[PDB]
Design a protein around this ligand. Sequence first.
Ligand SMILES: [Mn+2]
Ligand SMILES: [Mn+2]
Ligand SMILES: [Mn+2]
Lengths: 303, 303, 303
Amino acid sequence: KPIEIIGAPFSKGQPRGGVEKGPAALRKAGLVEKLKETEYNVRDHGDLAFVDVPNDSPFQIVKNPRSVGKANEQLAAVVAETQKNGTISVVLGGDHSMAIGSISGHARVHPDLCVIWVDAHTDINTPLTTSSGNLHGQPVAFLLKELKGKFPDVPGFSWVTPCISAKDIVYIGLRDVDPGEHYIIKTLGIKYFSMTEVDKLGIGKVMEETFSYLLGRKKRPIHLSFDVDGLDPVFTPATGTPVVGGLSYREGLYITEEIYKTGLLSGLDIMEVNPTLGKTPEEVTRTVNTAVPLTLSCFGTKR
Amino acid sequence: KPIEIIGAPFSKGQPRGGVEKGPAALRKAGLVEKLKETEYNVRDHGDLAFVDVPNDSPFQIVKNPRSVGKANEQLAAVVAETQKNGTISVVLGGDHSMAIGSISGHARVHPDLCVIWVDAHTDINTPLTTSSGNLHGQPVAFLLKELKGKFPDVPGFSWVTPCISAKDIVYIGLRDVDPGEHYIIKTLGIKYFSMTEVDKLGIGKVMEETFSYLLGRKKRPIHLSFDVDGLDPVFTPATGTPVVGGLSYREGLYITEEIYKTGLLSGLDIMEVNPTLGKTPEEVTRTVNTAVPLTLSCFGTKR
Amino acid sequence: KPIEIIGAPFSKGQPRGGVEKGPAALRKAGLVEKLKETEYNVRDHGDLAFVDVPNDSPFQIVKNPRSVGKANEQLAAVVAETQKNGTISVVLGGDHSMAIGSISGHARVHPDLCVIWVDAHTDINTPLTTSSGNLHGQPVAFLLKELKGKFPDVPGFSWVTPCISAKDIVYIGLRDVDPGEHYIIKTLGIKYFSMTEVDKLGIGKVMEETFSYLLGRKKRPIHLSFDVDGLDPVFTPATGTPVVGGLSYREGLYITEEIYKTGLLSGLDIMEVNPTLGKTPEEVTRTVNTAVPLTLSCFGTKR
Ligand SMILES: [Mn+2]
Ligand SMILES: [Mn+2]
Ligand SMILES: [Mn+2]
């Protein structure tokens, strides 16, 4: 019933900067201030202070493992708290590597949850199949019981227990998948609706279906990791990796009002806002601005 | 069968200027000239000359009541004429306050009409619940039998007879509603399709449904008040109050070709074009240009 | 199974320049290079060298007949070859006048094909009803058994045998049709889905239906002439004739992945890219870039 707002600023998951400024960007935008005005009660944990291991030299083809891993663990036990104390966590990131912390954190208390992952990418590459060492595209890989020990144990991710299986995760908005990831998602059986599916049925059904899949068997807590990169860049241009032809501002909101409407959202992530990849303020004012109504939409705001 | 084109230039409904230049903007664009070339016969009444009461000091929390009211009455009896003489009125406004004149005018002759209101706002705030004194957001409030004497009689709106009930009005494109208005529309039972509905079913059904609602019982004259502000600002940026994520240029047209296709459009309003709120000509050339094909689309132009 | 890539650079079909640079634009973009990486085998015929007849003085109201006609014939017998040798032709144009060559060429070998024409225009004006002499808008007129000798024989188009009837052609994305063309398409019975149809049912059904029309009776080779002008100009702005409110980048792709998916695409045209009508590189980088994924989408690339 009450929202705790965590700030998990972090760039280490990928090679560009400013991503750790994403949380301050949205707070300056008046997020918490505009959140207070819902039927919900808002507490503000502030931004975590990430422990940076000196020379945590890249492991195999994966950069910054010890700095990211330590960095998630802190997040994990901060989220497992808020949850325990009966509140809904909202993590303002940060790379999408923060999902490993956010979900392990959410899953310790609520271990029956499902994860509806609105991103343009699967973000599911094992430290093996990774092309770009960047862990920010391996989150799901790390949190899937079905892929355990399918990529040599990354150093500092040992605290990590394979949270979730392929049957409790759905992807919406996919349009830029790496072969290997397709090999995984397709061969692992992971349900999903990429841009084409959305095109053939429109979010109306897309949503009607992710629910008849996930909440079908039983109603359970919902964890939603919104990667701001899966909206169309015309909307959220200030991201690190923008692919064209995504969801629209109208579509993003329709996702949030529906998940809101179920009454089971116990966890949300507003990952990827990079206030320094936006040529011009307007572009930035546009990303931040649309990032925020998705948050608010998940908490009551209708049209 | 013949269209009379009235010009009802007016800003008094809201606090910004240039709105009264909207009609000249569309005529300069070649509206009447491009209208002549349809199967229809075009007469051009020219622009009305609005009587401005000296010091019609704001009534309670509502500015310019005596100047707006007088200003509508003239419109009313001009529209009730054209109608009487068997023609279809097209009012180029002007604030959306001109709907009070336009409909009372249309409803005296055709009292069975329905009103399909394509706007981003309900524009239904009683002189009571109004935040912004601006009457341009109280039109519907004034023309609804179901709300009579639910807001103290505004001075100069006495000539106004509660034209229409909650059952003969539909809203399409809503996305920026004030609480009070929601209280009214939701508690009054007013059918409508806000952006989310459009998202869940797409204009195809939206339209299929407003017709199965309104023209269901009997076929009756249709009055359509298109508020240019309910298209997406990417299209009609030169407006006074633009909310994001509205209908699209394709959607606007689909509304007009369908209403056209029914063969019952006896009245239309192209309200809100403000040629001075458009940073740059292009923005203005864009609003005017898209305002005009909506007019033409309602009169025969297909694709 | 193998794709031959022909380059048919040509401007003569219309009065603007740079259109003949369209093929080099897409090759520079890495088309052939990005095509090699599909399950398909890519040969590269290079760009044809078009014979330019000295003073082939305009015939009646139609400019450049002898230069365009000669120019197609060469294309025709180049395409009828590739086909014969069991390969799929891809013509990088060039005006849309190159369809006359491309189809006569495709139809000599595969005479049972159908043509799904994704353009914003019908491009079906007889040398009679033509307003703009420009042949680039008369292609279909020339290749239709049902219109034979319905426009005096243009000089140099005698080699042309009325390939295809009104029952083996469908149009998708229409939104800018000339009266005469409407007279033809509507009176000839030519099936089609203009923007409104797409609006009422969405490409999902549009496609589901062109297939239940064309491939209904029997499965047959598919020739697809994608006119880059029928996407929305926000996407492919660098064209000669852009009308607003077309298909979207998501929609274009949905066409290509479906046609791909049938397994009968034996011929494709990526017509109209003009690298000199794009104010700014970005606009050009945008047209070329989206032109290319449509090509690739037709050859395996999914999302
Ligand atoms: Mn992503
Ligand atoms: Mn409005
Ligand atoms: Mn075209």
